[PDB]
Design a protein around this ligand. Structure first.
Ligand code: CLA
Ligand code: CLA
Ligand code: CLA
Ligand code: CLA
Ligand code: CLA
Ligand code: CLA
Ligand code: CLA
Ligand code: CLA
Ligand code: CLA
Ligand SMILES: CC1=CCCC(C)(C)[C@H]1/C=C/C(C)=C/C=C/C(C)=C/C=C/C=C(C)/C=C/C=C(C)/C=C/C1=C(C)CCCC1(C)C
Ligand code: SF4
Lengths: 742, 147, 139, 80, 161, 74, 60
């Protein structure tokens, strides 16, 4: 039983004394401010626990309790989302008419004329239209009343209180020892089996006993207050067997392995529900039940306390071949002694999963009536692309913090890390060449087209009409997925998504999903994507690989992860740190994700979204202009940015005037950021000197001597306002555009 | 609308003057570099010590005032051109009402007058404004490459 | 005094971070040091190497690369026995550091001061005064 | 090469000499400060211009001053 | 009137502004039943809009050709309520904030740790200062003439040039 | 008429920057404080913080309220 | 001056030029800058002390 619970009791005293002493956590900051730099250095380094403490135990304790604090905030956030749905929303009116009522769960106070924001969202209601997709979640959950939304809100508040108690309790009363945190086999067994496996299984149970009966009655057309309460399905097994006759047999088919009996509610239909335009919830129930089984199975792989299981160290040390030296030896020690190495992996994977979520949810719309709510489809795609891109760049941020700090060459001799660092010139030169090739052969095709169209030579352009760059591999994969039902997925009845080909699914005369054809414009913008992702990898990988040393600076690890430069010598070493590649790679992430959401927005409006009428033909939002106009930059400028900015500019005096104001406000913040990005600290300190002089003249100089921001903080402030401004402009542009027309 | 833009033009004249005067008067020395005159007019910095000294030279204030000079002539020429194109149409009241807020400058000047320029070529043909339509994109490209 | 070219080199598996054509046609730097152990250190140019017990020898392209290794070898392995050489393609080997047997941060007799200015930094001459004149600004 | 100067305000703290990554600086004997020593710049052809010496210096205005000048292979810190 | 402007009470373009603003609200009200919360919300906005237009018309503001009020700020007394009096009100508050902030920074200099008083403010003493600001014009001018506002040029650090 | 105005204001802004740039080049390179004892030039440098801070105030004064009215109006 | 006295700095390139410090020690030996002065403001380097000569230092 070497996997055991070990706790120090009453480690840290619950006292308000350190609250009154800002900066108590570091030796530099605890002696108080003398310049204004102290104030900024206080906020900058506060959650950098491994910069304050030497011991991995105290660092692990601070992290565990801070994760409870984060959970408490998320539960509070969720509880408020339910309460605004319960109290300030048109949810009940939306349940009766999901295709007519626009979801709204935010009402403004009348103060300075701002009550114009309470627009007519429908259902005898005035409020701010919400695009987070909660209404579609709640109907998928089977909520059907505001009373149940109040109970969910209380359930979030109780959980929110319990997490903040646990964070206090596990830091101040019962803090686990380092040997508790260093149980990677136990944690993985429980997080696969217990968290993910029982998470899916329990949710499958809710889906089967609550979501499936309630949503069958809704899609049959029964009024929400005419629907039995969710526990009457749990007790009256006769009533549940009316909707799904397999329930007449109970749990004998489950235990005797006669699973085919359960095909009423555990289907493999594929495609969409014609009534709601969403995934069949009988499929999602089977999906979560099947996922639950193999998460519970996966969580029995590793060895804890009984000899059965794998040692993760043994798996890693055995995988070594003739190209890779000692192989994965020493990686277990890295990943059970470095939190940053763990955070680097988990941020890159969570960011990747968030990017996948964006693609899977628009193409295979999971919730009822979310596919034809186009403001939600655009909002949750754009939101989850940004979460993914940010989290991916923090994976390289913390891979750099690992390499600078937690990397020890003595324990990493001739293994995979040692070998990567020892040919990093070959990696970075090959990536650099790919990015030049990719930029020339993706963006240069656009420049070729701008010139040819401007020169009157439309026969010389790369277009469907002219020279054709077809995406044959993507078209071929689309062919296979339409052929899969009955052929390579024989028991499936419909395709995984109608985006691959097949029918047009219409709900309330609006397209839910329909085949997303790929042409020359799709070939061009996909290689635009591969170029922007590869350059982002190039900037971030070069920062991780050269974080400790270069040919330029032989001792970059002694300067740290985050330093501004090593002087104007060697020609100039401005922005040479690993932090400065995260800084430069967040711009190229911003560039990458901006083109992705622009590609998504224009393609869905031009080729997918719109209205169906007689003869079954579809009138799209921008009328199919993507194919012949997304091949030039002038087409993107004119037919996408200029044409679709009309709604946000003409929004003044409407309920969308808030988006019009945020459009201008974010344009401001973006431009203001360039003051911090294009300027240097030395100018601003000398300007402050004259301002200090005028204060000295009036005897009003401060005792905390004002300083210009650090070189790094000028970069961090410039990047933050650039991101706030750039993303905030697109947020207003996307939301005012798609609320008006979709 | 003319009152507001003249005070914006006043803001930009005093701010450009500020950077340039500060560059001229701190050129010989400052508190960060009291011996700044020993290094010349255009030097990169004095290194990361003393808090950091990026853009500390007198040349760098020329550099910084160049952005403010471009901004001010933009505000001047945007004003001149919008006031004149609305008068030349016979619709001076469009400038009178829309110039007092910034969305009027965005939609009634930049967005509204963009349409003949960005239609100099399109998938339906080209006309003699195709060269300015290409210079327009060319200018956005050079400007962004400077970033 | 002169570099014994036969001194064995630390066990290293190679890297792309080593020296290029400019080392074999312009100049190369070498560092020697004594190790009491057969222990792993970090190369300035890449990954990790193992210094052999006894005398080691490396070749690097930059003088700063040899001293960055010297700093690390003295801060973590307490080897103060390091000698840095400059090597020209003519075969000439030029001893560099420590230049007179004593480290620069320790005073030594017979060191002549270079670059020393008799006044404080504020007493320099204005540029206008020495314009079209060869006279130096340090007084 | 770069030009590195030491002014007679040097208190002989040896910090510039310890911070120099290229062994440009050393300590010579003096009698103008309590420490009996002043910094010296005998090997400025090896100065890369990092100005780590200036950062290390604690006198109010720097006793050691680096003046970036003509660039060479050594002072550009080129390993190629 | 002044500068060829028209009093807003007789401007026809001001009259059309008020009517168009109410027609815009009344057509939103035409989609709701009488006692509903959206009907009461819009009926209260039609009352507020009419009240604002009535007040502006009777206030002596001057309208343009565009039917919007224009402010005269040249110093004439018939128009002092648009800039001169709001400005006099502002400068009283601004000098109050300045006098009070200056008084606290001088107090904090005589403290045991002067920079701890500026990130942890002695709130009873800082409230003692905020109350003193009501007579800042007399307090600050007497401060000036008693040689305690302005420090001489030779106790101020300047750049060598 | 539009091109000619735009052309010459842009030429004007470049010329105005260059004058101040070459005034900065003058002080660094060509100005001798000992041949200019108590001049208008030396007395400019003697109250340069008075000049620079009062430009700083007037810029902020104009900027706060000009942008503030425009944002109010928007 | 004498140890412990308050002095106004007259070195034009000092951070504390025309500011007040307090004299820490005065070296009797033939040192070029024998007056040690401590200040309450830190310089841009975060140093709060410097050496000075007698002709760079005036009692207040
Ligand atoms: C977590 C997410 C979240 C978010 C973003 C919102 C957002 C909002 N809520 Mg909702 N709400 C939430 C959770 C949330 N709520 C939860 C969990 C509940 C259940 C209790 C509610 C219950 C609720 C009601 C009942 C109402 C709102 C209302 C509102 C709106 C106005 C709030 C306001 O101005 O009050 C401001 C109230 C104040 C007292 C101002 C306090 C400002 C202080 C100074 C903030 C300082 C924080 C402090 C310094 C932190 C440090 C502590 C200290 C020791 C140092 C706004 C849209 C109102 C609304 O929609 O009206 C139409 C409304 O009536 N909310
Ligand atoms: C079955 C066992 C189990 C489960 C469910 C969890 C669950 C969790 N652990 Mg893990 N953990 C376990 C065992 C388990 N742990 C063991 C054995 C160890 C020792 C090796 C650890 C060590 C560990 C560390 C070091 C950390 C976690 C963290 C977390 C949280 C991850 C963030 C997240 O997704 O939360 C959101 C998802 C939720 C579902 C929220 C649920 C909140 C409760 C606690 C879940 C369980 C409730 C209860 C069992 C369900 C009752 C059902 C009943 C109604 C029928 C999550 C609550 C991290 C964290 O955030 O700390 C707080 C973290 O840093 N765990
Ligand atoms: C700043 C972070 C942030 C914020 C504010 C949101 C906000 C939102 N998300 Mg997103 N999300 C994020 C990060 C974020 N997300 C990340 C990092 C992921 C990847 C794991 C996702 C994946 C995700 C999914 C898959 C869904 C949302 C949905 C939603 C919306 C409803 C919120 C809700 O009740 O969840 C409700 C969430 C659900 C009902 C289903 C969640 C199912 C997932 C698979 C549970 C996974 C839990 C597990 C512990 C995580 C393991 C991670 C893995 C790498 C090991 C809202 C717009 C929902 C939405 O768009 O509805 C319209 C939705 O279905 N989110
Ligand atoms: C954690 C998830 C969860 C939970 C708490 C429950 C809980 C329950 N299920 Mg459900 N169920 C689940 C997942 C879950 N189920 C999944 C994943 C499936 C798919 C295989 C089913 C399929 C299922 C069926 C088909 C039936 C239940 C039934 C029941 C009830 C058990 C009554 C009994 O023993 O007699 C069961 C009857 C026998 C003859 C034995 C109980 C309310 C029964 C019930 O009461 O229906 C409402 C029932 O008939 N469940
Ligand atoms: C699970 C996620 C996670 C976690 C736990 C951490 C944790 C940490 N990171 Mg990592 N990071 C992450 C994600 C994460 N990061 C992501 C997604 C990125 C990409 C942007 C980074 C990029 C990154 C860098 C580049 C650095 C860190 C650093 C740090 C450490 C210091 C934190 C601190 O003191 O900041 C204190 C927190 C603040 C000062 C908050 C201010 C930040 C912004 C500007 C405010 C937020 C704006 C807001 C959302 C919108 C405002 C609305 C507006 C309209 C008003 C800590 C170890 C630093 C370090 O040195 O580690 C050793 C460091 O240099 N991280
Ligand atoms: C429009 C603005 C713009 C442009 C064109 C570039 C261009 C480039 N950046 Mg830069 N970058 C920008 C803004 C821009 N950046 C900004 C704002 C930032 C701020 C954070 C950065 C930060 C940044 C970093 C950190 C990195 C780059 C990299 C790159 C290169 C990508 C490789 C490539 O595509 O090669 C192909 C070249 C192009 C697409 C340029 C346009 C050429 C087109 C096809 C026309 C060519 C015409 C032809 C030459 C005419 C010849 C005749 C003529 C001379 C008369 C390329 C040189 C990366 C790099 O260099 O690695 C490879 C890299 O690491 N950039
Ligand atoms: C651009 C320069 C400028 C300046 C600085 C002023 C300044 C002033 N004008 Mg204005 N004015 C200007 C141009 C200017 N004007 C122009 C171009 C016109 C159009 C012809 C006017 C038309 C105008 C009128 C019609 C009146 C003023 C008045 C005033 C004075 C009233 C302020 C006050 O309280 O003082 C006087 C009060 C005190 C000192 C104490 C009061 C308590 C003030 C001195 C008024 C005034 O009193 O004239 C002297 C007045 O009746 N002005
Ligand atoms: C109340 C304290 C106070 C006082 C009396 C002054 C006085 C002055 N300042 Mg300001 N200043 C202050 C605080 C103060 N400053 C703060 C906190 C900052 C940081 C933002 C600045 C930044 C600043 C700049 C950048 C400039 C001045 C300038 C000036 C001068 C002209 C007036 C002006 O432009 O105001 C402008 C005021 C601001 C831009 C910011 C003021 C912000 C708030 C409102 C003041 C602080 C309130 C404070 C918390 C008081 C709490 C008191 C309580 C504890 C009892 C004058 C010497 C200008 C100058 O030198 O021209 C000759 C100039 O260019 N100051
Ligand atoms: C939109 C872009 C933008 C904006 C607003 C500014 C604004 C400013 N610049 Mg910068 N600048 C920019 C772009 C911009 N610049 C660029 C691209 C460059 C080239 C690198 C420069 C280079 C530059 C230099 C070199 C100088 C300036 C100066 C100035 C000031 C001149 C105007 C003034 O004095 O008062 C205008 C004041 C404002 C606009 C401040 C706005 C008021 C704020 C928004 C109040 C809002 C408070 C709000 C509650 C905050 C919410 C935060 C939230 C998290 C809660 C001002 C701070 C000069 C300066 O500082 O002199 C004093 C100066 O020397 N700028
Ligand atoms: C930086 C620098 C360092 C040192 C050296 C340096 C090169 C010198 C310097 C550069 C300095 C620079 C670049 C300085 C730039 C200086 C500039 C641009 C000065 C502008 C002067 C304009 C004036 C005085 C207009 C007067 C009009 C009047 C009186 C009209 C009157 C009227 C008439 C007749 C008709 C209408 C009615 C009224 C209104 C009554
Ligand atoms: S101080 Fe600024 S300009 Fe100089 S090297 Fe460092 S980052 Fe570059």
């Amino acid at each position: 039983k070497k996997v055991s619970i070990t706790v120090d009791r009453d480690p840290v005293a619950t006292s308000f004394e350190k609250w009154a002493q800002p900066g108590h956590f570091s030796r530099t900051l605890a002696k108080g401010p003398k310049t204004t730099t102290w104030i900024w250095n206080l906020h900058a380094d506060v959650h950098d626990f491994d910069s304050h403490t030497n011991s991995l135990e105290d660092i692990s304790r601070k992290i565990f309790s801070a994760h409870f604090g984060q959970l408490s905030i998320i539960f509070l956030w969720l509880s408020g989302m339910y309460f605004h749905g319960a109290r300030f929303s048109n949810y009940s009116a939306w349940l009766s008419n999901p295709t007519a009522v626009k979801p709204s769960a935010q009402v403004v106070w009348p103060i300075v004329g701002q009550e114009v924001l309470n627009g007519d969202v429908g259902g005898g209601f005035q409020g701010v239209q919400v695009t987070s997709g909660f209404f579609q979640i709640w109907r998928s959950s089977g909520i059907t009343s505001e009373v149940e939304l109040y109970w969910c809100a209380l359930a979030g508040l109780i959980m929110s209180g319990l997490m903040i108690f646990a964070g206090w309790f596990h830091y101040h009363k019962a803090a686990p020892k380092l040997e508790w945190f260093q149980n990677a086999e136990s944690m993985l067994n429980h997080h696969l089996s217990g968290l993910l496996g029982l998470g899916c299984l329990s949710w499958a149970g809710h889906q089967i006993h609550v979501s499936l009966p309630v949503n069958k009655l809704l899609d049959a057309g029964v009024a929400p207050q005419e629907i039995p309460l969710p526990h009457e399905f749990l007790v009256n097994r006769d009533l549940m067997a009316q909707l799904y006759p397999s329930f007449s047999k109970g749990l004998v088919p489950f235990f005797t392995l006669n699973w085919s009996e359960y095909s009423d509610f555990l289907t493999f239909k594929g495609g969409l529900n014609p009534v709601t335009g969403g995934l069949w919830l009988s499929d999602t129930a089977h999906h979560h039940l099947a996922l639950a089984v193999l998460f519970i199975v996966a969580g029995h792989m590793y060895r804890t306390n009984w000899g059965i299981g794998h040692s993760m160290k043994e798996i890693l040390e055995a995988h070594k071949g003739p190209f890779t030296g000692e192989g994965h030896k020493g990686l277990y020690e890295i990943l059970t002694t470095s939190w940053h190495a763990q955070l680097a992996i988990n941020l890159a994977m969570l960011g990747s999963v968030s990017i996948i979520v964006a693609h899977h949810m628009y193409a295979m719309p999971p919730y009822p009536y979310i596919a034809t709510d186009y403001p939600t489809q655009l909002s949750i795609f754009t939101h989850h692309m940004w979460i993914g891109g940010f989290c991916v760049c923090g994976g390289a941020a913390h891979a750099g913090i690992f390499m600078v700090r937690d990397y020890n060459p003595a324990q990493n001799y001739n293994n995979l890390l040692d070998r990567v660092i020892r040919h990093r010139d070959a990696i970075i030169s090959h990536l650099n060449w790919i990015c030049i090739f990719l930029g020339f052969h993706s963006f240069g095709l656009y420049i070729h087209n701008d010139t040819m169209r401007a020169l009157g030579r439309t026969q010389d352009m790369f277009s469907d009409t002219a020279i054709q760059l077809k995406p044959v591999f993507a078209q071929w994969v689309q062919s296979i997925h339409t052929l899969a039902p009955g052929n390579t997925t024989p028991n499936a009845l419909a395709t995984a998504s109608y985006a691959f080909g097949g029918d047009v699914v219409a709900v309330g005369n609006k397209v839910a999903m329909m085949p997303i054809s790929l042409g020359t414009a799709d070939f061009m913008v996909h290689h635009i994507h591969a170029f922007t992702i590869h350059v982002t990898v190039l900037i971030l990988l070069k920062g991780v690989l050269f974080s400790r040393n270069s040919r330029l600076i032989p001792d970059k690890a002694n300067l740290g992860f985050r330093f501004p430069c090593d002087g104007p010598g060697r020609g100039g070493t401005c922005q040479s740190s690993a932090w400065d590649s995260v800084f430069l790679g967040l711009f190229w992430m911003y560039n990458c994700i901006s083109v992705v959401i622009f590609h998504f927005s224009w393609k869905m409006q031009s080729d997918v979204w719109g209205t169906v009428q007689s003869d079954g033909t579809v009138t799209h939002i921008t009328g199919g202009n993507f194919a012949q106009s997304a091949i030039t930059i002038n087409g993107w400028l004119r037919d996408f940015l200029w044409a679709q900015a009309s709604q946000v500019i003409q929004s003044y005096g409407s309920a969308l005037s808030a988006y019009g104001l945020i459009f201008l406000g974010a344009h401001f913040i973006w431009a203001f950021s360039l003051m911090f990005l294009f300027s240097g600290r030395g100018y601003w300190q000398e300007l402050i000197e004259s301002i200090v002089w005028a204060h000295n003249k009036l005897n009003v100089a401060p005792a905390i001597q004002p300083r210009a921001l650090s070189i790094t903080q000028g970069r961090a402030v410039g990047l933050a306002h650039y991101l706030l401004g750039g993303i905030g402009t697109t947020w207003a542009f996307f939301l005012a555009r798609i609320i008006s027309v979709g | 609308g003319d009152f507001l833009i003249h005070h914006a033009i006043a803001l930009a004249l005093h701010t450009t003057t500020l950077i340039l005067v500060k560059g001229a008067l701190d050129a010989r020395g400052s508190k960060l570099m009291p011996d700044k005159k020993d290094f010349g007019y255009a030097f990169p910095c004095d290194g990361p010590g003393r808090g950091g000294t990026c853009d500390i030279s007198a040349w760098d204030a020329f550099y910084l005032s160049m952005f403010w000079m471009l901004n001010t002539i933009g505000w001047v020429t945007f004003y001149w051109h919008w006031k004149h194109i609305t008068i030349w149409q016979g619709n001076a009241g469009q400038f009178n009402e829309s110039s007092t807020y910034i969305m009027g400058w965005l939609r009634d000047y930049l967005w509204l007058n963009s349409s003949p320029l960005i239609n100099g070529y399109n998938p339906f043909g080209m006309n003699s404004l195709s060269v300015w339509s290409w210079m327009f994109l060319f200018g956005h490209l050079i400007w962004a490459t400077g970033f | 005094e002169t570099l014994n070219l036969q001194i064995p080199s630390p066990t290293f598996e190679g890297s792309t971070g080593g020296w290029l054509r400019a080392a074999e046609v312009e100049e190369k730097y070498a560092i020697t040091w004594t190790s009491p152990k057969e222990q792993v250190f970090e190369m300035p140019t890449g990954g990790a190497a193992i210094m052999r017990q006894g005398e080691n020898l490396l070749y690097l392209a930059r003088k700063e690369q040899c001293l960055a290794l010297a700093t690390q070898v003295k801060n973590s392995f307490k080897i103060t026995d390091y000698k840095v050489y400059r090597i020209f393609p003519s075969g000439e080997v030029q001893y560099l550091h420590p230049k007179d047997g004593v480290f620069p941060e320790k005073v030594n007799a017979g060191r002549v001061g270079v670059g020393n200015v008799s006044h404080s930094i504020g007493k320099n001459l204005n540029p206008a005064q020495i314009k079209f004149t060869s006279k130096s600004f340090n007084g | 090469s770069h030009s590195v100067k030491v002014y007679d305000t040097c208190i002989g703290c040896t910090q510039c000499v310890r911070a120099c990554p290229c062994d440009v600086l050393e300590m010579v004997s003096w009698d103008g400060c309590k420490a009996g020593q002043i910094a010296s710049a005998p090997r400025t052809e090896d100065c890369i211009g990092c100005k780590r010496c200036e950062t290390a210096c604690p006198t109010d205005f720097l006793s050691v001053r680096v003046y970036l000048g003509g660039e060479t292979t050594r002072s550009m810190g080129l390993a190629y | 009137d002044v500068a060829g402007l028209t009093p807003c009470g007789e401007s026809k373009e001001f009259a059309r502004r008020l009517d168009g603003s109410v027609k815009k609200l009344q057509t939103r009200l035409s989609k709701y039943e009488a006692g509903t919360p959206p009907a009461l919300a819009l009926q209260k906005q039609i009352d507020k809009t009419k009240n604002r237009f009535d007040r502006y018309g009777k206030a002596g503001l001057l309208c343009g050709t565009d039917g919007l009020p224009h402010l005269i700020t040249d110093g004439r007394w018939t128009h002092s309520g648009e800039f001169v009096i709001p400005g006099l009100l502002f400068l009283y508050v601004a000098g109050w904030i300045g006098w009070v902030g200056r008084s606290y920074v001088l107090f904090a200099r005589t403290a045991d740790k002067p920079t701890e008083k500026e990130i942890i403010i002695d709130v009873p003493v800082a409230l003692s200062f905020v109350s003193t600001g009501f007579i800042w014009p007399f307090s600050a001018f007497k401060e000036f003439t008693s040689g305690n506002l302005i420090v001489p040029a030779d106790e101020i650090t300047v750049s060598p040039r | 008429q539009s091109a000619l105005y735009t052309h010459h204001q842009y030429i004007a802004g470049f010329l105005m920057v260059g004058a101040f740039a070459h005034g900065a080049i003058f002080f660094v390179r060509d100005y001798d404080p000992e041949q200019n004892k108590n001049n208008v030039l030396a007395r400019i440098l003697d109250h340069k913080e008075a000049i620079i801070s009062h430009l700083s105030w007037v810029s902020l004064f104009l900027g706060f309220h000009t942008l503030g009215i425009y944002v109010h109006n928007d | 001056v004498k140890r412990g006295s308050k002095v106004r700095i007259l070195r034009k390139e000092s951070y504390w030029y025309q500011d007040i410090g307090t004299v820490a020690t005065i070296d009797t030996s033939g040192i070029r800058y024998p007056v040690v002065v401590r200040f309450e403001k830190v310089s841009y380097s975060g140093v709060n002390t410097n050496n000075f000569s007698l002709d760079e230092v005036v009692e207040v």
